Amino acid sequence: VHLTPEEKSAVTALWGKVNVDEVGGEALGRLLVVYPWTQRFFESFGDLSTPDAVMGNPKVKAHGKKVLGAFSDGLAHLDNLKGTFATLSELHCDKLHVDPENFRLLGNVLVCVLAHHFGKEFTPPVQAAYQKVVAGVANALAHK
Amino acid sequence: VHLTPEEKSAVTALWGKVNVDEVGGEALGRLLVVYPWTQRFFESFGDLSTPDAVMGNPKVKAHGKKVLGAFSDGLAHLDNLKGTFATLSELHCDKLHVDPENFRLLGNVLVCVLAHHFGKEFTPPVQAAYQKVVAGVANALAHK
Amino acid sequence: VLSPADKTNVKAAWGKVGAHAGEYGAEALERMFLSFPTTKTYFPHFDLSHGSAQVKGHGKKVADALTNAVAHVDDMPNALSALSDLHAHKLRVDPVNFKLLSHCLLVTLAAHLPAEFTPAVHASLDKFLASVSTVLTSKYR
Amino acid sequence: VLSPADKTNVKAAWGKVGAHAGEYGAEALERMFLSFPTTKTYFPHFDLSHGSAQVKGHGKKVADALTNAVAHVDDMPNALSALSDLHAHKLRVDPVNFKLLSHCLLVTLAAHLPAEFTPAVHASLDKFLASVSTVLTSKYR
Numbered sequence: 107v108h109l110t111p112e113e114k115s116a117v118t119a120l121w122g123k124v125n126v127d128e129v130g131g132e133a134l135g136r137l138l139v140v141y142p143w144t145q146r147f148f149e150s151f152g153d154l155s156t157p158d159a160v161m162g163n164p165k166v167k168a169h170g171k172k173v174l175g176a177f178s179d180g181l182a183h184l185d186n187l188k189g190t191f192a193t194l195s196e197l198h199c200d201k202l203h204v205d206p207e208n209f210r211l212l213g214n215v216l217v218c219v220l221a222h223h224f225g226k227e228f229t230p231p232v233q234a235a236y237q238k239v240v241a242g243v244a245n246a247l248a249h250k
Numbered sequence: 251v252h253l254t255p256e257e258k259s260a261v262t263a264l265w266g267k268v269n270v271d272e273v274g275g276e277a278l279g280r281l282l283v284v285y286p287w288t289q290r291f292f293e294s295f296g297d298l299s300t301p302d303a304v305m306g307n308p309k310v311k312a313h314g315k316k317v318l319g320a321f322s323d324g325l326a327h328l329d330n331l332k333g334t335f336a337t338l339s340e341l342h343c344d345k346l347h348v349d350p351e352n353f354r355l356l357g358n359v360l361v362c363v364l365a366h367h368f369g370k371e372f373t374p375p376v377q378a379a380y381q382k383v384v385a386g387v388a389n390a391l392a393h394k
Numbered sequence: 395v396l397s398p399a400d401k402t403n404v405k406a407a408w409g410k411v412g413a414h415a416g417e418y419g420a421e422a423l424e425r426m427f428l429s430f431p432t433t434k435t436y437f438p439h440f441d442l443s444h445g446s447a448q449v450k451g452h453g454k455k456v457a458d459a460l461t462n463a464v465a466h467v468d469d470m471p472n473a474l475s476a477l478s479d480l481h482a483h484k485l486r487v488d489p490v491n492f493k494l495l496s497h498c499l500l501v502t503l504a505a506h507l508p509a510e511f512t513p514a515v516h517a518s519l520d521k522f523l524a525s526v527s528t529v530l531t532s533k534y535r
Numbered sequence: 536v537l538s539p540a541d542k543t544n545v546k547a548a549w550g551k552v553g554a555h556a557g558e559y560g561a562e563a564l565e566r567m568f569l570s571f572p573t574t575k576t577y578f579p580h581f582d583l584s585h586g587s588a589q590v591k592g593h594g595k596k597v598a599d600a601l602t603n604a605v606a607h608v609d610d611m612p613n614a615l616s617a618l619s620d621l622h623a624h625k626l627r628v629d630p631v632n633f634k635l636l637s638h639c640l641l642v643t644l645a646a647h648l649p650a651e652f653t654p655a656v657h658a659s660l661d662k663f664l665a666s667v668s669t670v671l672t673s674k675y676r
């Protein structure tokens with residue numbers, strides 16, 4: 107992924123305000139809510155009966171934190187996403203058999219979460235930069 | 251794309267029996283009929299007003315042979331699809347801006363046309379081998 | 395959304411199947427299992443061998459559901475509500491799988507009804523199957 | 536397929552949009568054009584610069600169409616038939632473009648109505664936009 111310095115700065119500045127203990131849990135929870143078949147993958151997480159059950163799920167939040175850590179990792183290795191996400195690709199593709207369309211969905215839900223949290227700051231140009239990032243990540247994961 | 255020896259034979263044998271002059275036009279025509287937004291890319295082809303008009307269009311039959319020719323190149327070089335379709339990738343993505351999902355649609359329509367033509371000869375195992383080829387081609391075209 | 399012509403095309407084509415329903419249904423599933431191995435993960439306790447009685451039986455069920463859908467084409471969600479529950483709520487089948495089965499059904503039909511599988515009919519069937527897929531992947535109850 | 540609660544959620548959230556519908560539709564377009572440049576290919580005759588009068592004007596038409604869809608949630612096909620004709624038949628918009636706009640719409644709303652943008656409303660809106668998209672991409676008349 108190639109970001110102009112302008113874009114890099116914008117992306118970074120907003121990422122610096124992200125609540126790391128929370129945003130990932132929010133993004134994953136919303137994925138489970140908005141695209142219900144994804145719950146099939148997290149049957150061990152417990153009660154995912156309702157949006158409330160899902161959003162409050164302790165395991166969702168814990169897991170959400172791991173997902174976010176991966177995006178942060180991506181942000182730091184934009185020039186080598188495929189090498190960086192090699193292991194994750196293998197995990198999701200070969201072992202879990204997650205269809206690649208779902209990676210795009212998680213990325214889009216993450217964008218919705220940022221928009222939700224930063225409103226006015228999440229301008230069109232900032233969104234444009236974040237879309238390149240999340241497409242890059244989705245592409246690396248689907249490499250396998 | 252990795253085909254077992256058995257799969258390769260099955261695929262190449264059936265391929266030798268395909269009417270190179272007509273199958274390509276049938277596949278392209280069906281794409282235009284079945285997923286009509288695709289017509290937008292062939293505006294210069296004339297009358298695509300009706301299925302009949304589509305199916306009978308000389309520029310569609312002519313273009314169809316070009317497409318099939320590309321499938322043949324792939325078959326002969328399953329080893330290096332990416333390299334083989336490098337230039338085509340470029341045309342389709344860079345200059346035409348064809349969404350990659352459309353590559354999958356055409357590969358699938360070709361499978362239907364093969365089944366239509368060969369009847370019972372187009373068995374499940376024969377279909378399975380062909381699905382690997384079309385996925386291979388589709389991925390290589392989307393490479394860019 | 396199906397057009398009036400779409401419905402007519404579907405009724406004509408599907409009508410041809412007849413007593414072959416279960417046969418075509420079984421063949422479509424086998425095409426799916428072979429071409430898209432991941433789909434097998436939804437049938438953990440099945441005998442998925444070639445010519446399996448389990449698959450034949452299931453093929454029948456699938457085909458009947460389609461007949462049911464054709465007979466209620468204009469009010470599908472009410473007719474297939476039980477099936478949505480199962481696939482959307484209980485099984486939680488990823489929608490991509492419906493594209494896979496749909497494609498395998500089209501291939502089966504093409505291979506068996508050469509005179510009916512025209513471009514126009516091919517188009518109508520594609521749309522119909524997409525419609526059915528949308529209903530089975532929705533939670534509207 | 537939309538459930539009864541989905542319909543309630545849409546009506547309630549679109550109700551909050553209200554008089555801002557026009558600016559939100561304009562912002563959604565701008566968001567799409569910047570983020571997914573290939574979409575610009577459908578508007579070659581447009582000044583797509585920031586604050587363009589044409590985009591502004593256009594965002595108003597889109598939002599009005601959505602308001603009408605919300606009011607005819609149980610009868611979209613009939614209400615949007617003219618729009619279906621334009622996008623499916625005349626413009627031949629590739630279906631992927633609808634998913635892009637839908638996404639940009641959701642981002643705009645989340646940005647502007649954070650309190651209202653709950654998981655449940657988010658899910659209802661997503662389903663609604665998918666439904667609108669299906670109608671506009673279909674040729675049924």
Ligand code: HEM
Nearest residue numbers: 144147148172173176177202204208209212213243244247
């Ligand atoms: C951008 C997309 C995604 C990213 C960055 C991501 C990241 C991760 C990470 C960092 C892990 C932990 C692996 C470990 O234990 O080291 C993980 C595990 C997992 N992910 Fe994802 N993921 C993504 C998309 C998805 C999607 C869309 C699904 C399913 C709908 C999914 C399902 C799972 C499952 C089932 C696990 C294993 C859970 C367990 O350990 O029990 N992932 N993912």
Ligand code: HEM
Nearest residue numbers: 288291292316317320321346348352353356357387388391
């Ligand atoms: C498996 C998929 C495909 C293959 C193998 C393929 C192959 C080809 C080939 C060999 C050419 C001729 C280039 C030249 O030598 O002039 C071509 C041109 C073209 N293709 Fe495709 N194509 C595929 C899919 C598509 C799709 C899905 C679309 C859009 C719906 C599309 C639209 C076009 C257009 C508009 C041209 C025009 C170039 C000219 O004017 O020659 N193609 N394609």
Ligand code: HEM
Nearest residue numbers: 433436437455456459460477485487491492495526527530
């Ligand atoms: C046109 C699309 C489909 C139709 C019409 C359909 C129809 C049916 C029917 C009629 C049943 C039997 C329910 C009963 O026992 O009354 C069934 C069960 C089932 N379907 Fe489908 N189905 C479709 C697609 C799929 C897909 C794409 C998958 C996953 C790849 C799937 C997986 C299953 C499973 C796992 C069962 C339950 C098996 C059992 O335990 O008996 N179905 N379906």
Ligand code: HEM
Nearest residue numbers: 574577578596597600601618622626628632633636667668
């Ligand atoms: C939520 C889905 C959409 C809705 C409700 C919608 C609504 C509309 C409306 C209301 C009009 C103008 C009607 C008139 O006065 O003639 C229009 C025109 C148009 N739409 Fe959309 N649209 C949607 C999605 C899209 C998408 C995804 C694209 C392509 C990226 C697109 C491209 C166009 C174009 C090119 C025109 C004609 C503009 C002109 O030349 O004046 N629309 N649409």
